[PDB]
């Protein structure tokens with residue numbers, strides 16, 4: 467079945483994934499849950515998401531998204547969708563970096579459930 471995500475990403479993120487899970491107490495079960503579109507404002511999962519974004523320069527130290535870098539990572543068929551979604555979902559806000567990413571995740575997942583994923 468079609469999947470926009472390219473296979474190369476998985477090995478590329480492996481080291482950071484392991485580190486981020488360890489740092490924040492994230493379980494694979496929590497990742498599975500958010501991947502299926504189920505998310506709650508639990509730091510062990512929200513901080514994991516922040517951690518991974520940060521690792522790949524997709525956010526700054528205050529969880530502001532670098533839209534150009536994000537766009538650069540996405541395939542051509544997703545560009546306009548991403549700009550539309552980002553139009554809606556940015557700027558981020560929340561009580562802290564992890565909560566900012568929670569709010570962002572909620573917005574993005576709701577706006578584009580069919581393309582949503584978390585590694």
Ligand SMILES: CCCCCCCCCCCCCCCCCCCCCC[C@@H](C)CCCCCCCCCCCCCCCCCCC
Nearest residue numbers: 475478515518519522539547548551571574578581582583
């Ligand atoms: C409409 C499109 C929506 C996108 C679906 C949600 C997935 C967003 C995760 C970001 C992944 C973007 C590219 C995926 C890999 C591209 C492969 C290219 C390899 C180049 C090096 C690989 C790394 C740069 C991979 C970085 C992985 C970051 C994982 C972050 C997971 C946490 C997501 C939580 C927040 C989501 C909002 C993030 C803000 C996104 C707004 C709009 C797109």
Ligand SMILES: [Cl-]
Nearest residue numbers: 530531557558
């Ligand atoms: Cl932002």
